[PDB]
Each structure stands twice: as structure tokens, then as C-alpha cells.
Design a protein around this nucleic acid. Sequence first.
RNA 1: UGGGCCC
RNA 2: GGGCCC
Length: 475
Amino acid sequence: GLIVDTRDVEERVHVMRKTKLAPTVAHGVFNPEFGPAALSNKDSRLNEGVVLDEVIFSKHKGDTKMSAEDKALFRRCAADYASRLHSVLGTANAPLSIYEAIKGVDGLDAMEPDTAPGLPWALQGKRRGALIDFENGTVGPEVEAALKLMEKREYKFACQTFLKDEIRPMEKVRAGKTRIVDVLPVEHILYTRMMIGRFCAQMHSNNGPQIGSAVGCNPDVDWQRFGTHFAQYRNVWDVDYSAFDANHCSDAMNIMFEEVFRTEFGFHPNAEWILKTLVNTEHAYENKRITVEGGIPSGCSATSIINTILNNIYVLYALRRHYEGVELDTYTMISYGDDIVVASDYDLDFEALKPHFKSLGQTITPADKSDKGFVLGHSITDVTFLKRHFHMDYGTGFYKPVMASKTLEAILSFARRGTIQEKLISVAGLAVHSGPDEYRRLFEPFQGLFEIPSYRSLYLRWVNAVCGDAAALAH
RNA sequence: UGGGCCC
RNA sequence: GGGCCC
Ligand SMILES: [Mg+2]
Ligand SMILES: [Mg+2]
């Protein structure tokens, strides 16, 4: 977005310095070009003269303004996508009860009982369990008074900036390109879940290209469903964005919320309101308070769904700005936030679409390396979605999600102290698709020191997961 | 850390 | 309570 004001206040909000990610035995074997993100201004691995505070907010390069015609076109696209979306999901979008918003429903997982509470509770030393009863599904006086203000639409808040402690390519670690989490207040997440939680539940349940959303998917079983779909098409594109989250313009966000979350679609009048509070935001980072116009905070409830929805509308908007007669049947797409796979039988020109995404403030680039522009003919077996390739399983004849070995090495090279055994078992569930030999190699530095699931046990587990039939057919 | 999915 | 993706 656009940074409009940078206040210096006396109250300092501390951020998590020093990584909790420790090198594992595998790090010495694989030596990956990956490492924990820089968390301190004077980190020894940082490039000379690089101030960490400056790089964090370098993504904020302006809140791009749209003309009336682009806004009317956008409204049209948001309405058209909203039509398809609500046609599939239905219109049972009435507010969730407090109990349901805390504990979740079918499709929506419960709120995390002991994550960050946000502001101003962070300045009071309070955990989430001090404000909200997660077992009973009830809230205390503080949250209830805040819910009263949100009912009245008078609620004001700030976002707590957190440095994302994560494994990153050493280039971005050296560039100081640490990603940040905008931690929102716990009552905000609660109310957003009350306003749009049922909608979010229905989205997860109905994931697939029909609604253009992979939010709620299980790549183990759904790679078959998505894989067969996109292979059916002449052209497939792996479209990359740069700072997709931050570059959502206030025009696009506002219109999207107005078109998708209308009361005629079953929503409470405040669904549109609570989401609109995400457009213009105040962020607290240490000594500085930074006011931003545009972009989406990451700690928001439904941030992935909002991003997914926007992604769908962007692609429709771009094509309609360049071509005539472009409808929702003209192409097919799946997304998960910024991650996107597009396909069509029309030889569409995504290189020509670049400026049309720029009118929304988005920069599209080919994922297929730094190759000279978007090209045609590419299939689903060439693209990457959710850091996973689409690869045919020799034996079963099903698509499987395959991660790059360099990434799997990176993941296995670092762990939070004491979580290493548990990490190995979950990552095994990812590594199984790389094949028996590569599976053996990835866990080779761990043999004798930990329990490593056999290749056979996870392969038979995956076979049953993707389909109960072929597992029984093997008998 | 939010919206998943997995143990 | 972890891990992955986003
Ligand atoms: Mg939560
Ligand atoms: Mg991609």
C-alpha cells in the first residue's frame, strides 16, 4: 500500500529477535542455500549497510488509483465472480454465534487458544486465554465491549508487526527481505469469523476450479482432482506475483467487499464493514506507528480467502480489459492466496496482460524461471502450485504432489529445539512422493538417531488416501 | 500469525 | 502441541 504517515511514539512494541530455528544433523550433509530469516538489525549474515527496518516496508510502493471505467469494469467482474461463487455455495451466510466462531464448524477449524492476542493486549501481558474462554466458547468483558463497538461500527484498532521467523533462501536472508506478520487483535478475528465464518466454511468444503479456490484442500488427495482437470486444457500458465498482499489497491478491495459480501447474498450488514477496516490500517513496529492505505494485513481472519477471491477477479478483469467477450467459461483457474494456476484452450497472451494487472498495481511475471515472457503449450506437469509439482505416479496412475529436493533438504536442515522427531514424521508425508531412492537419501543423516517412517508405510497410506478403490484393487 | 491441510 | 503450504 501507501505509507501516508510515520509517527514516533514513546510506547515501544518489542519484536521477536533471535531465531528459534536451529540447524539439524542434515544441515552438515546437505548444506542448503537456505537459512533462518534475519531478525536483528545487526545480524552477522546481513549485507553491509542494510537496515532491516527499511526493507520490511519497501513492499509499500503506493496505493494505485483506478479510473471510473476500470472501477466499473472491476465491479462488473467482482459481481460476475460473486454470482458463480454464491451460486455454488448457496446463501446461508448469516452470522456465526460467538461459540461457533471460537470452536469452528464443519469446514472451519477452531481459533488457536494460545496464539498472539494483538493490540492493545500485548502491552498488558495478556494471553488469549485471559480474554476468551476457548473451552466454553465464551468471551470476557474486554472482548464483549469491543464487540459492542464493532456492532456500532465505531471500533478502532492497530496491527502488531511481527518478524516472520522462517526458513528462507540465503539470498533473501542476505538482502534482509524478512517477511512480516500483521497480528490483528483477537476480537477482530473473532468478529470477522462471526461475519463471514460460514461463508469461509462453505468455501473450504467446495474447493476446486469451479470456484477457483484451493483453500481447504489436501494436496495428497486433491492433486488427482486438480491434475486431471488442468491436463484437459491446451495451455497452462504458472503466474507469479510480487508482493500480492501489499499491492491490493483500496479501489479493488473496497469494490470486491461491496460486491461479494452483499446482504442479498445472506450476509449481515457488518460483513462488508469489518472487511473494509482492513483497507486503511495503522501498524505498530517498535517505536514507530505507521499508517498505510491499501494492501491486506496477514493476521486477518480469511486473509487467504480474500486473496483468493481477489486473484479470481483480477484474472477476469485483466482478460476483459484486453479482449472482448471474455466470460468465466473462457478459462479455468485455481488459486490459494497469491499462488495461481491458470488454463485455457484459447491461446491467451499473458505477456500483453502485464499492463492490465498494473492498472490494479499488480506485477505478473512468469514462474517458469526468469524466461523471456509467458509462452504457450505448457501443461500441468510443468507448473508449481503450493511448492508442489504435478507428477504421475508410476504404479497407481494418479497425480501426486512432488516438492523439489532442494526445498525438502532446506526444510529438513532446520528445526525448533525438541520438535525434530515430530517434524521428521510430517515431512516424511511430503517426501514420500519424491520416490523410494530420494526418500532414502533425504532421511539418510537421521538414520539411527530418530524414527524414520518406512517408504512402504506412507505409500500405502497415500494410496488409500487418494482413493479407497485402488488400495482394495491391489487385493 | 491468519485461512487451510497433516500427525 | 508440533510440522508444511499460503
Ligand atoms: Mg485464531
Ligand atoms: Mg506459482
